[PDB]
Amino acid sequence: CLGHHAVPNGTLVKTITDDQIEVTNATELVQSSSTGKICNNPHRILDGIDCTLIDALLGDPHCDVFQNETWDLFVERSKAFSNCYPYDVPDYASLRSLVASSGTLEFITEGFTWTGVTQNGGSNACKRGPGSGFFSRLNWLTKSGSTYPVLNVTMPNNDNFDKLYIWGIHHPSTNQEQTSLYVQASGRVTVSTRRSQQTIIPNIGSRPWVRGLSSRISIYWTIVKPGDVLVINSNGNLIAPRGYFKMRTGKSSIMRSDAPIDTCISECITPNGSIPNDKPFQNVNKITYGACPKYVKQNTLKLATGMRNVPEKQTRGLFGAIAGFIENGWEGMIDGWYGFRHQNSEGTGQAADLKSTQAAIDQINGKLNRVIEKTNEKFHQIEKEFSEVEGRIQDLEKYVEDTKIDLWSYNAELLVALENQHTIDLTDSEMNKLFEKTRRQLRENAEEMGNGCFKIYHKCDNACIESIRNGTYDHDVYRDEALNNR
Amino acid sequence: CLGHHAVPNGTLVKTITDDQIEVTNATELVQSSSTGKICNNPHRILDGIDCTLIDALLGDPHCDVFQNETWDLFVERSKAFSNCYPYDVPDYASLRSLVASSGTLEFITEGFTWTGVTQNGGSNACKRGPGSGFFSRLNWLTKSGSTYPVLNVTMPNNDNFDKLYIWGIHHPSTNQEQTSLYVQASGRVTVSTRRSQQTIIPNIGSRPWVRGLSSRISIYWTIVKPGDVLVINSNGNLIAPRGYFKMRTGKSSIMRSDAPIDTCISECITPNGSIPNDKPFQNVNKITYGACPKYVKQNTLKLATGMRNVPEKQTRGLFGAIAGFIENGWEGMIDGWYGFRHQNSEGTGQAADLKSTQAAIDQINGKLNRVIEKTNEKFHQIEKEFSEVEGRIQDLEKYVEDTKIDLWSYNAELLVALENQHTIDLTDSEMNKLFEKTRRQLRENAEEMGNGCFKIYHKCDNACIESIRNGTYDHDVYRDEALNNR
Amino acid sequence: CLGHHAVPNGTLVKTITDDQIEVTNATELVQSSSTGKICNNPHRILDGIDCTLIDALLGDPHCDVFQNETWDLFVERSKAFSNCYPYDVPDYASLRSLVASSGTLEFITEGFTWTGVTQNGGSNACKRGPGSGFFSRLNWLTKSGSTYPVLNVTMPNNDNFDKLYIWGIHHPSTNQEQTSLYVQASGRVTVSTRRSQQTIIPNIGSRPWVRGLSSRISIYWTIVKPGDVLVINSNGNLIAPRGYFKMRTGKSSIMRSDAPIDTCISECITPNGSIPNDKPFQNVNKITYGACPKYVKQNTLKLATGMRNVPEKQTRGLFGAIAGFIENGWEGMIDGWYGFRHQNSEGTGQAADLKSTQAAIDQINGKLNRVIEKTNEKFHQIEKEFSEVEGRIQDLEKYVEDTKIDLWSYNAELLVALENQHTIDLTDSEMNKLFEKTRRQLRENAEEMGNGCFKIYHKCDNACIESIRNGTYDHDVYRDEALNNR
Ligand SMILES: *[C@@H]1O[C@H](CO[C@@H]2O[C@@H](C)[C@@H](O)[C@@H](O)[C@@H]2O)[C@@H](O[C@@H]2O[C@H](CO)[C@@H](O[C@@H]3O[C@H](CO)[C@@H](O)[C@H](O)[C@@H]3O)[C@H](O)[C@H]2NC(C)=O)[C@H](O)[C@H]1NC(C)=O
Ligand SMILES: *[C@@H]1O[C@H](CO[C@@H]2O[C@@H](C)[C@@H](O)[C@@H](O)[C@@H]2O)[C@@H](O[C@@H]2O[C@H](CO)[C@@H](O[C@@H]3O[C@H](CO)[C@@H](O)[C@H](O)[C@@H]3O)[C@H](O)[C@H]2NC(C)=O)[C@H](O)[C@H]1NC(C)=O
Ligand SMILES: *[C@@H]1O[C@H](CO[C@@H]2O[C@@H](C)[C@@H](O)[C@@H](O)[C@@H]2O)[C@@H](O[C@@H]2O[C@H](CO)[C@@H](O[C@@H]3O[C@H](CO)[C@@H](O)[C@H](O)[C@@H]3O)[C@H](O)[C@H]2NC(C)=O)[C@H](O)[C@H]1NC(C)=O
Ligand SMILES: *[C@@H]1O[C@H](CO)[C@@H](O[C@@H]2O[C@H](CO)[C@@H](O[C@@H]3O[C@H](CO)[C@@H](O)[C@H](O)[C@@H]3O)[C@H](O)[C@H]2NC(C)=O)[C@H](O)[C@H]1NC(C)=O
Ligand SMILES: *[C@@H]1O[C@H](CO)[C@@H](O[C@@H]2O[C@H](CO)[C@@H](O[C@@H]3O[C@H](CO)[C@@H](O)[C@H](O)[C@@H]3O)[C@H](O)[C@H]2NC(C)=O)[C@H](O)[C@H]1NC(C)=O
Ligand SMILES: *[C@@H]1O[C@H](CO)[C@@H](O[C@@H]2O[C@H](CO)[C@@H](O[C@@H]3O[C@H](CO)[C@@H](O)[C@H](O)[C@@H]3O)[C@H](O)[C@H]2NC(C)=O)[C@H](O)[C@H]1NC(C)=O
Ligand SMILES: *[C@@H]1O[C@H](CO)[C@@H](O[C@@H]2O[C@H](CO)[C@@H](O)[C@H](O)[C@H]2NC(C)=O)[C@H](O)[C@H]1NC(C)=O
Ligand SMILES: *[C@@H]1O[C@H](CO)[C@@H](O[C@@H]2O[C@H](CO)[C@@H](O)[C@H](O)[C@H]2NC(C)=O)[C@H](O)[C@H]1NC(C)=O
Ligand SMILES: *[C@@H]1O[C@H](CO)[C@@H](O[C@@H]2O[C@H](CO)[C@@H](O)[C@H](O)[C@H]2NC(C)=O)[C@H](O)[C@H]1NC(C)=O
Ligand SMILES: *[C@@H]1O[C@H](CO)[C@@H](O[C@@H]2O[C@H](CO)[C@@H](O)[C@H](O)[C@H]2NC(C)=O)[C@H](O)[C@H]1NC(C)=O
Ligand SMILES: *[C@@H]1O[C@H](CO)[C@@H](O[C@@H]2O[C@H](CO)[C@@H](O)[C@H](O)[C@H]2NC(C)=O)[C@H](O)[C@H]1NC(C)=O
Ligand SMILES: *[C@@H]1O[C@H](CO)[C@@H](O[C@@H]2O[C@H](CO)[C@@H](O)[C@H](O)[C@H]2NC(C)=O)[C@H](O)[C@H]1NC(C)=O
Ligand SMILES: *[C@@H]1O[C@H](CO)[C@@H](O)[C@H](O)[C@H]1NC(C)=O
Ligand SMILES: *[C@@H]1O[C@H](CO)[C@@H](O)[C@H](O)[C@H]1NC(C)=O
Ligand SMILES: *[C@@H]1O[C@H](CO)[C@@H](O)[C@H](O)[C@H]1NC(C)=O
């Protein structure tokens, strides 16, 4: 025989035509399993134990261990929180993705001149050590005695890099508190380059008790390029900077997870943990930092590497080829043409307040009342329409993505099936051709029993088997025996 | 011969390489035809003869036959209209899809206390029977004598289901009419849970004559969950509820069509009618309630089940295999991975009015004039920009969808072609191999004429044909004849 | 032998399983190269040498050579500019695509009656010949002495086509200039059909020095259909029309490029130049006017048309088939189902101005101040949110498109590979079958050396080669020789 030795407990592979045909020895192609831990090499992984990237940026009193810290990849934990002044970031997502892509928190201190104000404002919700305090990159300027002049400061950017400037605005709870910190009964912050300006004004209002405060701080940012100048004008409710952060650009990012940290080596990091990158595809999660297999939607793709399992029982002899190299060639096609994700970036504004106008005569007395009421309602209408729209965009965004994955997974399944069908037909044809080549060489001594194996009527020593293996055979030795049988 | 019996008037199938090759007996794979009628089983189909789902909800006087009605699927007719008070629904589409997905109009009456108002407001455009009337789920409260107090009512939800509350607001034609129904010269409706509030105000204005009215009613809804409370405040122009509708969730929906209703059995309902679900794909329409074949863009996919049609003429004998099972296996691949549609939901607002401010001093006299004019124009700008945006979204939405269908149809065509090519090669190979197996058995008695059939030189009775069929043949019987011919 | 004659310097083709296998004679399938020039036949190509389509429309003094000009395709140059009054078009893109799709600039003059105004306003930035001038389709009406009445004019459309009416509004630099041209200290333009109205008001403001003017003109359009009427009301800052343009619809468009113009014939025009349309796919650019090959992302797809290159050395004889027709059949599949692009249309508004309210008492004094300030900031907020949204839409738009191309290119690569694999297997099988048919005919005279060629032991004249070619051979002639060798 050449009967492929009846390998026990082989497995299923999909083909284009038949389904669940069985093969001698199969390979899996979707690494579906995770240890649950992130290696500490060869990447530089940084554990934000109880802070977020924003809180390390601002300088939280319990994250002063992250100062001038250098990451390849930032990991946020869910068990993180703020233990400082309660704050707010309009377009939070955009700021975070900028800081994330930089890969550094190198903070370079600068010489600002705050004439006619008191520096280093204190809070009891951000006690640094035993006494009152605040964030470590920001200066909370208040009135110096009983005056607050218009802070008008300038800084040219003369160097060969871009500077990132972080600033904000204070929202009081009552007008009394407003006057107590800032002599003027309303504030204004103007931040200008040669290419942009943002003017914001405080919104005095009561908000829920959070760590014993009903006031809030809104955080804004500005990006100055080599050759530009920045000009900060204000007349109250200003949180000044004390420097700029050095920007780079490259391969750096951020991933949210609750996985531990180990001492292995792995380059392929997901929120489920480390994945060996041997396989072409992985089913574990979509987000992949480093170099990773692409994402399919299925649990098993079995790529076949040898024969169907034909027999009742084994018989020794020579045999033909094995699938060998073919795996990386096909891998080439689909690897080449698959994409990288479009990154959910905008998310949403997610505002939760009544932002109407405030005066009894203006809003609830006379024709003017109705107008102002109508204006606020019109804006509410606008806001709700806006949310509807943004939601619809994000819904569509999801649909596109899901469509993509499906179609690629269908392609992947078809391709595996095509290879297995071809592979089966290749090996089958080779065996059949070789067997009948042997039949023409046999010269009537033996006959196939029907399972692609020759029933030999006579015996012969290993010399005959060698002669068959080299295709140099003559039938004279068995002439007398065959004639007697015939 | 084994000449496959020359089946007359076979048909075309697509292959990957050749086109319009012909086969013995072909199958169609796209059920393209409709009776035009909807079966009344096994689904519960409800015919909205002259009402829409919204009109059955509100309680139209000529659709009181739909009270506590239970549908699996709702069908709207185009010949439907309203014969009651002219009305308006902001975000009409959202409300309808909610009611549609429920599958019920179980209306549970509740005990509201309307102090200091007159109940059961009348209209001559909604005459119930012979005298004036209104909708059957709503209470039109008006002034009781010469007073209208602030209606402030509360209802806790103590049960184990969510309640759907339907309410509205009255838009008069003139301020005189406003004062005649409501002592206050302006109205306001505040509807609040622990999780939301909507404050709307009437827009006094003249609108086109519709069934003898220039006034309009705007319809709004609120969704209260187990444990919550609702608080309705108003000071005029209020259309109160009289209860809540019991919500479910499951498999229920709505489809617009002008098809009749029969007494067959069919589970696959489209706006063209009932479709048998035998086939894998259908070309009839995209929307499909129940279990239906997927949608392709082509008129015929012919999947092949047997040989090419080779001969000049027939000759009897045995023959080999037929395609058999293969159809459901491949069906598996593409069924598995195809998607369900993303449902056009938002559509558009589709507002058609001038919604500007109104005062001669405020809008057309002085600097104030210019400001107010500028504000209204700015809002008009906003509205038009909004429409542009929404339109662009919906345009893109269409493009995505069309792209999807094409790509899937291309996949479907490729897959059918792959199977037919393989199928042809499978059968062809089997015949050729079997024929030459027979040739080696023949031992020189007959010779192939060139059409995969043996020209036999001698005659022989059915014994010889049986001996050939079982592959147990010897040539001794025809030795003398063959020698004489040779 | 039948050894396929060892064709020197054949090339690579991709297969599904093996990669970079070699074939005798290969064909390329992506026309990747351009001359750099646009043919002047058979299409009517029009060269906008120093004007854009908008500037030819308005009647620029240096593009009076484009009057009643007829194009199949419009080409804009980058070296084009305006040398007339500085202007502005809100939704510039929409207007341009309308004019582009028409294919004509037939301007039909009409009889307007401008009572109580002075016609033919002059500018020194649009000097026509040696003296002051303006655009050639528009009438700049100013005050006649010391009065400016309300221009209220009407025109019914009684004909069997739609009319395109082009008009505008003047934005001054100072109120003094406003009063000097228009007695009223503010203007207003109302343009109404039975189906729409646009009321715009001038925005007095200083803007950058452009060719010695700080004033600007905003250009608007209106589309009147057969049976309608148009009514233009104004009280200042109005740029009147002098006629309508005849609309068509068909196959006409616009393409931006810096290519020269030749005297060849080509129907397939891209911004890189003319492309012969022989091939199925092209890699040159995406935009294609006329009939063109579809766009793939790859540099070479090699479709195979004959054998692998097997030998050490050649030997003469007959041979089998060649690939022939197969190319257009497969071309059919993918041509059929590919799409045409979704046309970037909206682009963006791209506004660059501070459009706030203006009064010292209204904006910077008292509670009113804060309100007005808040309103302008709220609108700025709205504008920025709008831009964010539009940007996100256009970003997504890009992503969809890129996804599409990839997936199609992957399909194209797979299809080429499938054909080449099949083609190789087809030819290989045919040769092998024919060779062993010849072996059974040989009757022991010759034996294959191992390269699909027969080593012949004896000699024989061309008679033997003919006898082999027709399959009518007997071994008697070589009996004595073979017996002696044996
Ligand atoms: C946090 O980072 C700051 C800034 O330095 C930056 O981060 C460091 C870790 C390194 O990566 C630096 O290359 C990088 O710029 C550290 O500030 C550094 O402090 C020293 C001591 O004050 C500075 O030396 C001074 O240099 C000036 C300028 O020549 C002299 O005039 C002084 O006499 C003195 O020699 C050093 O230059 C400064 N780095 C900068 C601005 O170049 C800081 O120590 C570091 N650690 C913290 C806060 O944890
Ligand atoms: C429309 O529906 C209402 C509400 O009932 C609901 O729909 C029915 C068709 C059934 O599906 C009900 O299970 C479902 O809740 C019908 O109202 C029903 O009316 C009867 C008679 O008034 C009520 O019986 C009363 O029950 C109360 C509470 O125990 C007693 O105090 C009374 O003495 C009396 O026995 C019945 O409970 C009520 N269903 C409800 C609220 O449970 C209504 O008849 C029906 N038909 C219409 C309008 O066409
Ligand atoms: C630019 O185009 C205008 C309008 O004509 C249009 O374009 C032409 C090139 C042709 O394609 C026309 O078929 C097309 O309508 C040209 O105006 C044409 O001018 C002549 C001479 O004034 C008009 O003839 C008159 O017709 C009227 C109406 O019957 C008589 O009352 C007059 O006595 C006279 O015969 C001709 O009709 C008019 N075309 C129109 C409106 O039908 C213009 O010459 C041309 N060239 C420019 C500006 O370069
Ligand atoms: C790896 O860790 C991630 C993060 O915990 C796991 O993601 C989670 O996967 C489950 C799948 O059932 C998600 O549940 C469902 O999500 C859908 C929306 O995607 C929602 O409609 C359902 O109601 C349900 O919540 C879960 O949200 C998701 N969590 C995330 C994204 O934070 C993932 O399963 C883990 N994988 C492995 C192999 O451990
Ligand atoms: C089943 O019934 C539906 C509903 O009547 C039929 O749908 C209709 O199909 C035609 C196809 O020509 C549509 O006409 C064209 O629609 C496109 C937009 O899709 C438009 O650009 C063209 O100007 C033209 O109107 C028609 O709109 C569409 N009607 C709908 C959706 O209500 C369908 O053809 C019927 N199918 C069969 C097999 O009877
Ligand atoms: C045909 O002419 C067009 C127009 O000049 C050429 O298009 C240009 O192609 C290059 C490719 O490198 C583009 O450069 C890159 O574009 C991307 C965005 O697509 C941008 O992110 C990169 O920073 C870089 O600018 C270039 O923009 C593009 N120009 C256009 C569209 O006007 C095209 O290459 C020419 N083709 C041939 C074969 O000559
Ligand atoms: C079945 O196929 C797998 C393919 O992974 C074979 O696994 C190899 O096993 C040898 C040791 O026997 C390792 O040195 C190789 O690295 C493994 N991988 C590869 C790439 O071949 C396995 O041996 C096969 N089993 C049988 C019975 O043939
Ligand atoms: C507020 O700040 C700006 C920028 O620092 C000042 O404008 C500069 O004023 C100086 C002195 O007159 C000029 O030499 C510069 O050319 C100005 N620069 C720019 C960019 O305008 C402005 O004077 C300051 N205003 C006040 C009231 O202090
Ligand atoms: C051609 O193929 C069709 C396949 O649908 C055959 O149709 C079958 O016909 C028999 C009766 O002759 C029915 O009992 C089957 O249910 C039909 N369907 C299937 C699934 O086979 C048809 O008979 C074939 N015709 C010929 C001449 O072979
Ligand atoms: C309007 O309605 C609300 C809710 O029913 C009333 O608020 C409740 O008032 C009672 C009596 O003072 C309190 O016990 C409740 O705690 C209040 N509930 C809530 C949710 O606020 C309110 O008093 C009513 N106002 C008027 C003027 O009648
Ligand atoms: C290799 O294939 C190409 C296919 O384009 C052959 O090109 C043909 O060449 C002849 C002249 O020899 C022209 O008349 C044809 O129009 C060409 N095109 C086609 C469609 O066949 C080329 O001759 C082939 N070379 C060899 C050596 O066989
Ligand atoms: C401004 O123009 C409109 C339209 O030309 C005038 O309205 C028409 O007036 C005439 C005379 O009274 C009527 O016969 C028409 O029926 C009106 N048409 C429409 C569409 O309203 C209007 O009179 C003009 N106003 C002024 C002040 O001149
Ligand atoms: C291998 O397969 C046989 C099938 O009968 C099964 O009984 C056996 O348990 C398998 N493997 C082992 C664990 O012996
Ligand atoms: C079957 O095909 C033949 C082709 O010649 C045609 O004449 C005949 O009409 C067909 N069917 C019938 C209706 O006889
Ligand atoms: C053909 O291929 C051979 C490979 O050795 C190369 O040397 C030769 O230069 C090629 N063509 C020509 C230019 O002679």
CSV table of C-alpha atoms in Angstrom, one decimal, chain C residues 92-256:
chain,number,residue,atom,x,y,z
C,92,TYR,CA,-20.2,78.0,-4.7
C,93,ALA,CA,-20.0,74.2,-5.5
C,94,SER,CA,-23.8,73.7,-6.1
C,95,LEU,CA,-24.0,76.6,-8.7
C,96,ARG,CA,-20.9,75.3,-10.5
C,97,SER,CA,-22.1,71.7,-10.8
C,98,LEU,CA,-25.5,73.0,-12.3
C,99,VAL,CA,-23.7,75.2,-15.0
C,100,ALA,CA,-21.2,72.3,-15.6
C,101,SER,CA,-23.9,69.6,-16.3
C,102,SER,CA,-25.8,72.0,-18.8
C,103,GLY,CA,-23.0,72.1,-21.4
C,104,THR,CA,-23.8,75.7,-22.7
C,105,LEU,CA,-23.5,79.4,-22.1
C,106,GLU,CA,-26.4,80.6,-24.3
C,107,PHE,CA,-27.5,83.9,-22.6
C,108,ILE,CA,-30.9,85.2,-23.6
C,109,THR,CA,-31.4,89.0,-22.9
C,110,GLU,CA,-34.7,90.1,-21.3
C,111,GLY,CA,-36.6,93.5,-21.0
C,112,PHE,CA,-36.5,94.7,-17.4
C,113,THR,CA,-37.8,98.2,-16.5
C,114,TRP,CA,-35.6,100.0,-13.8
C,115,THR,CA,-37.7,103.1,-12.9
C,116,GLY,CA,-36.2,105.7,-10.5
C,117,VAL,CA,-32.5,104.2,-10.6
C,118,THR,CA,-29.3,104.8,-12.6
C,119,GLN,CA,-28.1,101.7,-14.6
C,120,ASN,CA,-24.5,100.5,-15.6
C,121,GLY,CA,-22.6,101.1,-12.3
C,122,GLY,CA,-18.8,101.4,-12.9
C,123,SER,CA,-15.6,100.1,-11.1
C,124,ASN,CA,-11.8,100.9,-11.6
C,125,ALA,CA,-10.9,97.2,-10.6
C,126,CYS,CA,-13.0,96.0,-13.6
C,127,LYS,CA,-12.0,98.6,-16.3
C,128,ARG,CA,-13.5,97.4,-19.6
C,129,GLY,CA,-11.1,98.7,-22.3
C,130,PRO,CA,-9.5,102.0,-21.1
C,131,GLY,CA,-12.4,103.4,-18.9
C,132,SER,CA,-14.3,102.1,-15.8
C,133,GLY,CA,-16.6,99.0,-16.2
C,134,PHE,CA,-18.2,95.9,-14.7
C,135,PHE,CA,-19.4,92.3,-15.6
C,136,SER,CA,-21.4,91.8,-18.9
C,137,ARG,CA,-24.6,89.9,-17.7
C,138,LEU,CA,-25.4,92.0,-14.5
C,139,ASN,CA,-26.7,95.6,-14.0
C,140,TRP,CA,-25.4,97.5,-10.9
C,141,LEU,CA,-28.3,99.9,-10.2
C,142,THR,CA,-27.5,103.0,-8.0
C,143,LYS,CA,-29.6,106.1,-6.8
C,144,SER,CA,-31.0,108.4,-9.6
C,145,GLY,CA,-30.2,111.9,-8.3
C,146,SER,CA,-31.1,111.7,-4.5
C,147,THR,CA,-33.9,109.0,-4.5
C,148,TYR,CA,-33.9,105.1,-4.6
C,149,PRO,CA,-37.5,103.6,-4.8
C,150,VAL,CA,-38.4,99.9,-3.9
C,151,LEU,CA,-37.6,98.0,-7.2
C,152,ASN,CA,-40.5,95.5,-7.5
C,153,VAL,CA,-40.4,93.6,-10.9
C,154,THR,CA,-42.1,90.5,-12.2
C,155,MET,CA,-41.5,88.0,-15.1
C,156,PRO,CA,-43.8,85.1,-16.0
C,157,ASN,CA,-42.1,82.0,-17.7
C,158,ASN,CA,-44.6,81.1,-20.6
C,159,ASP,CA,-42.1,78.9,-22.6
C,160,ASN,CA,-41.3,75.1,-22.6
C,161,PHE,CA,-37.9,75.3,-20.7
C,162,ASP,CA,-36.6,76.3,-17.2
C,163,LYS,CA,-34.8,79.7,-16.9
C,164,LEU,CA,-31.7,80.3,-14.7
C,165,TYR,CA,-31.6,83.8,-13.2
C,166,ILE,CA,-28.3,85.1,-11.6
C,167,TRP,CA,-28.4,88.1,-9.2
C,168,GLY,CA,-26.5,89.4,-6.1
C,169,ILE,CA,-26.1,91.9,-3.2
C,170,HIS,CA,-23.4,94.7,-2.5
C,171,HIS,CA,-21.5,94.7,0.9
C,172,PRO,CA,-20.1,98.2,1.5
C,173,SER,CA,-17.0,99.1,3.7
C,174,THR,CA,-18.6,102.1,5.5
C,175,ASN,CA,-22.1,103.5,6.2
C,176,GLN,CA,-21.0,106.7,4.4
C,177,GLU,CA,-20.4,104.7,1.1
C,178,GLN,CA,-23.7,102.8,1.7
C,179,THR,CA,-25.6,106.2,1.9
C,180,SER,CA,-23.6,107.6,-1.1
C,181,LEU,CA,-24.8,104.8,-3.5
C,182,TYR,CA,-28.2,104.0,-1.7
C,183,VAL,CA,-30.1,106.8,0.2
C,184,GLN,CA,-31.5,104.3,2.8
C,185,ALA,CA,-28.9,103.4,5.6
C,186,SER,CA,-29.7,99.6,5.1
C,187,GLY,CA,-30.7,97.4,2.1
C,188,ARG,CA,-32.8,94.2,1.6
C,189,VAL,CA,-33.2,91.8,-1.4
C,190,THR,CA,-36.4,89.5,-1.6
C,191,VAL,CA,-36.5,87.0,-4.6
C,192,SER,CA,-39.7,84.9,-4.8
C,193,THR,CA,-41.4,82.3,-7.0
C,194,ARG,CA,-44.7,80.5,-6.3
C,195,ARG,CA,-42.4,77.9,-4.5
C,196,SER,CA,-39.6,79.8,-2.6
C,197,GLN,CA,-38.2,83.1,-1.3
C,198,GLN,CA,-34.7,84.3,-0.2
C,199,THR,CA,-34.4,87.6,1.8
C,200,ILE,CA,-30.8,88.7,2.4
C,201,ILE,CA,-29.5,92.0,4.0
C,202,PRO,CA,-26.1,93.7,3.6
C,203,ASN,CA,-23.3,93.2,6.2
C,204,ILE,CA,-21.4,96.6,6.3
C,205,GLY,CA,-17.8,95.8,7.3
C,206,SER,CA,-14.1,96.4,6.5
C,207,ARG,CA,-12.2,93.5,4.7
C,208,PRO,CA,-8.6,93.1,3.4
C,209,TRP,CA,-7.3,95.3,0.5
C,210,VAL,CA,-7.9,93.2,-2.7
C,211,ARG,CA,-7.0,95.1,-6.0
C,212,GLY,CA,-7.7,98.4,-4.1
C,213,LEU,CA,-11.3,97.6,-2.7
C,214,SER,CA,-12.5,96.7,0.9
C,215,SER,CA,-16.1,96.0,-0.4
C,216,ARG,CA,-17.5,92.7,-1.6
C,217,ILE,CA,-20.4,91.3,-3.8
C,218,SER,CA,-22.4,88.1,-2.9
C,219,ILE,CA,-23.8,86.1,-5.9
C,220,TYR,CA,-27.1,84.1,-5.6
C,221,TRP,CA,-29.2,82.2,-8.1
C,222,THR,CA,-32.9,81.1,-8.6
C,223,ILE,CA,-34.4,78.4,-10.9
C,224,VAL,CA,-37.9,79.2,-12.5
C,225,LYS,CA,-39.8,76.3,-14.3
C,226,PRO,CA,-42.4,76.6,-17.1
C,227,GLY,CA,-45.6,78.2,-15.8
C,228,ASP,CA,-44.1,80.1,-12.8
C,229,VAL,CA,-43.5,83.8,-12.1
C,230,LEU,CA,-40.5,85.6,-10.4
C,231,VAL,CA,-40.9,88.8,-8.2
C,232,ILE,CA,-37.7,90.8,-7.2
C,233,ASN,CA,-38.3,93.3,-4.4
C,234,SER,CA,-35.4,95.5,-3.1
C,235,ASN,CA,-34.6,98.9,-1.4
C,236,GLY,CA,-30.8,99.0,-2.0
C,237,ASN,CA,-27.5,97.0,-2.5
C,238,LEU,CA,-29.0,95.0,-5.5
C,239,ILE,CA,-27.0,93.6,-8.5
C,240,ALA,CA,-29.9,93.0,-11.1
C,241,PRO,CA,-29.9,90.5,-13.9
C,242,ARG,CA,-30.2,91.4,-17.7
C,243,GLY,CA,-31.5,88.0,-18.9
C,244,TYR,CA,-31.6,84.1,-18.3
C,245,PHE,CA,-29.4,81.2,-19.5
C,246,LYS,CA,-31.0,78.4,-21.5
C,247,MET,CA,-30.7,75.1,-19.5
C,248,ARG,CA,-30.4,71.6,-20.9
C,249,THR,CA,-29.5,68.3,-19.2
C,250,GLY,CA,-27.2,65.4,-20.6
C,251,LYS,CA,-23.6,64.2,-20.5
C,252,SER,CA,-21.5,67.4,-19.6
C,253,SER,CA,-19.1,68.1,-16.7
C,254,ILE,CA,-15.9,69.8,-15.5
C,255,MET,CA,-12.3,68.6,-14.7
C,256,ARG,CA,-9.3,70.6,-13.2
